[PDB]
Design a binder for this molecule. Structure first.
Ligand SMILES: [Mg+2]
Ligand SMILES: [Mg+2]
Ligand SMILES: [Mg+2]
Ligand SMILES: [Mg+2]
Ligand SMILES: [Mg+2]
Ligand SMILES: [Mg+2]
Ligand SMILES: [Mg+2]
Ligand SMILES: [Mg+2]
Ligand SMILES: [Mg+2]
Ligand SMILES: [Mg+2]
Ligand SMILES: [Mg+2]
Ligand SMILES: [Mg+2]
Ligand SMILES: [Mg+2]
Ligand SMILES: [Mg+2]
Ligand SMILES: [Mg+2]
Ligand SMILES: [Mg+2]
Ligand SMILES: [Mg+2]
Ligand SMILES: [Mg+2]
Ligand SMILES: [Mg+2]
Ligand SMILES: [Mg+2]
Ligand SMILES: [Mg+2]
Ligand SMILES: [Mg+2]
Ligand SMILES: [Mg+2]
Ligand SMILES: [Zn+2]
Ligand SMILES: [Zn+2]
Lengths: 59, 136, 49, 79, 182
RNA sequence: UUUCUUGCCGGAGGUAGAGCUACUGGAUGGCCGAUGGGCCCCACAGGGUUACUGACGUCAGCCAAACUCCGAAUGCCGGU
RNA sequence: UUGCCUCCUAAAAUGUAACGGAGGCGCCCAAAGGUUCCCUCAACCUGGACGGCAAUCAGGUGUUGAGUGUAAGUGCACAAGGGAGCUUGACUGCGAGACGGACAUGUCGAGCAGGGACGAAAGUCGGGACUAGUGAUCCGGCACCUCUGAGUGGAAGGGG
């Protein structure tokens, strides 16, 4: 790893609105990333006709 | 007329009329063929003449192969020109034909009509030729 | 013209020791290289005259 | 009319100058060539124009090394 | 004395899952991930050379290491491209920071894709490496959306010691990649 | 006697010839089928068909002063 | 059309004519030179945001069909092809021995010394993969040198 050329890589904490936390590395110098959605509360990750319309009108 | 689409060298030394044909000496497509017995430059105009003679005789119901393609150019100088001033422009396209070479092949159901058709073609060619079969 | 003949002279003793060519558009600046100078008997800086 | 040709360069007299078994002095030119049709072998140098020349006296020996044709000098026994 | 989160999960759980699933004869045959390459093909740079610097800064923030600028190897008139023009930026991630990028990607970046309906499971190159493209760079929290001049997409390839697409798909699946079902 | 002649030994070669699924070009007939083209479903999309056209590939028969995977006889250089 | 370079004609050493068949040159490069170290194309198959036959990315097949500043030929994958670090040998004094050949020209060269470049070292380097990019002699210009200086010291002029 060449000394000066890279952006600094810092220990970061990621926190989510669903409360899920996990520690990782990141380029964010603040060392904290707040995020609205994650793998754990994305609906995709979790799994979350004309005749019928006719009968809603007239039955 | 048969002409090559392109040639790398448009002005060529004359083909050498020496030696017996080492390749294309047997009938490979039809059942009858014309085998050359003499050296000649066969031109594309002679090939056309001969092929049409075969077609006219059989009328229909046969297939004619031409085993020889006239890709060798022969030049000609303009008329009434003195010697020198560069080589002439290409004028004729010829095949270098050697004795033993099979020039034309024919498939036809009737042997009598087939042989007659090939004879009609031979009279169009500058050389002496005989009819040959696939058999030994 | 485009590649004129230039003479390299020794910076120390100013003897015109070498002649060579360069593209004056590719190298507008006076060419400066180290060459053996016979008078000085050592490699010296030489500069286009 | 006129031809656009009529041009040629001098013949460069290339080729093998010393054949197999010929005794040569050091420095003697062995082959004149354009590329490495022949490669330098033992006690044979290659000139900047790809001339092959002897680095030591001896007999010229042609041989193949890894397919490359090579010219070699073998030392001749002293009388 | 340390290990990236996803790497620990691989060594402790995913290896055993793959051995039970595919029944490899030798442990050296267990597929792992070799490297992740992130490529940005700024073809527009063949005229507007300022664009290269944006792609470089974005990749540096996204991956944590300086991109390498890739020169065009071949002139092509239709693209107005001259040989030697800087036309691409690439980053090769390996080891610990390849496991961290992957963990951030699977956990944070992919769920931030707009209208994300999962990735297609058919983007394997027959030898079980996976490639997929992104159209924008906003789904990375390391980039300030306040500061982007223009949407800059990229191609992300995960290369694997898997010998076939089925094994490579199983590995990425166990790695948490969100694949569609077809 | 270093010249020449004959026998033998050591050498380089690309002609004659030949060969080309060994290259660069030319080129005959099959087979196979990208590619356009017509037409039917009809939406311009995904497809099913046609006396068209034929890449690429493949089977067999070939051609070249400036083609060569090959390759003499002679000639030439040296030794004896 | 006239000089130079490459191929064929040219008959397997060399050489070989024609108003025979084809092209190129009267440069270019301060790196495209020197050295040390590393690397292997083109084409094709498969996958991938713009992106298509073809831009950049990834995997596979691929021994040479790519690339060698620039004609052609002989070469070069062992690379002479691609990349990178340092550098000026694109040297001064020389040169055993050869090629070529009417002559004048032209060409190759190990090795020795000086003072250097790169390299741990062995070593390589007297321009460029090689063969064109050029013009005799006379007359004259410029710089330098422990030469000469028309009675002598200078100087002019003349030498090297
Ligand atoms: Mg033959
Ligand atoms: Mg420069
Ligand atoms: Mg010549
Ligand atoms: Mg050289
Ligand atoms: Mg031989
Ligand atoms: Mg012949
Ligand atoms: Mg031949
Ligand atoms: Mg000869
Ligand atoms: Mg001869
Ligand atoms: Mg004569
Ligand atoms: Mg090189
Ligand atoms: Mg010079
Ligand atoms: Mg001499
Ligand atoms: Mg010369
Ligand atoms: Mg020295
Ligand atoms: Mg030397
Ligand atoms: Mg040179
Ligand atoms: Mg070079
Ligand atoms: Mg005079
Ligand atoms: Mg006086
Ligand atoms: Mg006086
Ligand atoms: Mg004076
Ligand atoms: Mg003088
Ligand atoms: Zn969450
Ligand atoms: Zn000096």
């Amino acid at each position: 790893m060449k000394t000066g050329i890279h952006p600094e890589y810092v220990d970061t904490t990621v926190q989510c609105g669903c409360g899920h936390s996990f520690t990782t590395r990141s380029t964010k110098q603040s060392g904290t990333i707040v995020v609205e959605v994650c793998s754990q509360c994305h609906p995709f990750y979790t799994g979350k006709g004309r005749v019928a319309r006719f009968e809603k009108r007239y039955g | 007329m048969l002409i090559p689409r392109k040639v790398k060298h448009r002005k060529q030394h004359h083909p050498e009329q020496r030696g017996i044909a080492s390749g294309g000496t047997s009938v490979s497509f039809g059942d009858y063929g014309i085998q050359a017995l003499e050296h000649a430059y066969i031109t594309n105009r002679q090939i056309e003449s001969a092929r049409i003679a075969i077609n006219r005789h059989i009328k229909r119901g046969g297939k004619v192969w031409i085993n020889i393609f006239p890709d060798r150019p022969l030049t000609k100088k303009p008329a009434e020109t003195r010697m020198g001033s560069g080589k002439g422009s290409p004028e004729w396209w010829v095949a270098n034909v050697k004795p033993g070479r099979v020039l034309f092949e024919l498939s036809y159901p009737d042997e009598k009509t087939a042989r007659d058709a090939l004879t009609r073609a031979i009279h169009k060619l500058p050389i002496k030729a005989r009819i040959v079969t696939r058999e030994e | 013209d485009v590649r004129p003949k230039i003479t390299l002279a020794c910076e120390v003793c100013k003897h015109r020791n070498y002649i060579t060519k360069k593209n004056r558009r590719n190298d507008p600046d006076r060419l400066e290289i180290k060459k053996f100078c016979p008078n000085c008997g050592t490699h010296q800086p030489h500069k286009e005259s | 009319s006129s031809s656009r040709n009529g041009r040629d360069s001098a013949a460069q007299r290339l080729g093998v100058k010393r054949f197999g078994g010929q005794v040569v002095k050091a420095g003697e030119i062995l082959v004149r060539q354009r590329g490495t049709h022949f490669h330098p072998g033992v006690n044979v140098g290659r000139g900047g124009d790809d001339t092959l020349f002897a680095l030591a006296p001896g007999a010229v020996e042609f041989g193949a090394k890894r397919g490359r044709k090579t010219v070699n000098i073998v030392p001749v026994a002293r009388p | 004395k340390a290990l990236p989160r996803l790497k620990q999960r691989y060594r402790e759980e995913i290896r055993e899952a793959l051995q039970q699933e595919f029944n490899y004869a030798n442990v050296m045959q267990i597929p792992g991930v070799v490297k992740v390459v992130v490529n940005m093909g700024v073809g527009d740079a063949a005229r507007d050379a300022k664009l290269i610097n944006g792609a470089i800064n974005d990749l540096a923030l996204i991956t944590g290491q300086k991109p390498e600028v890739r020169r065009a190897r071949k002139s092509i008139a239709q693209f107005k491209l001259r040989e030697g023009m800087p036309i691409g930026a690439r980053v090769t991630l390996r080891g610990d920071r390849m496991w961290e990028f992957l963990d951030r990607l699977i956990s944070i970046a992919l769920p931030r894709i707009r209208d994300f309906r999962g990735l297609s499971p058919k983007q394997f190159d027959g030898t079980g490496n996976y490639t997929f493209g992104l159209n924008e760079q906003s789904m990375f929290h390391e980039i300030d959306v306040d500061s982007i001049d223009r949407p800059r997409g990229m191609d992300i390839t995960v290369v694997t010691t898997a010998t076939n697409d089925a094994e490579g798909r199983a590995l990425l699946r166990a790695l948490g990649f969100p694949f569609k079902e077809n």
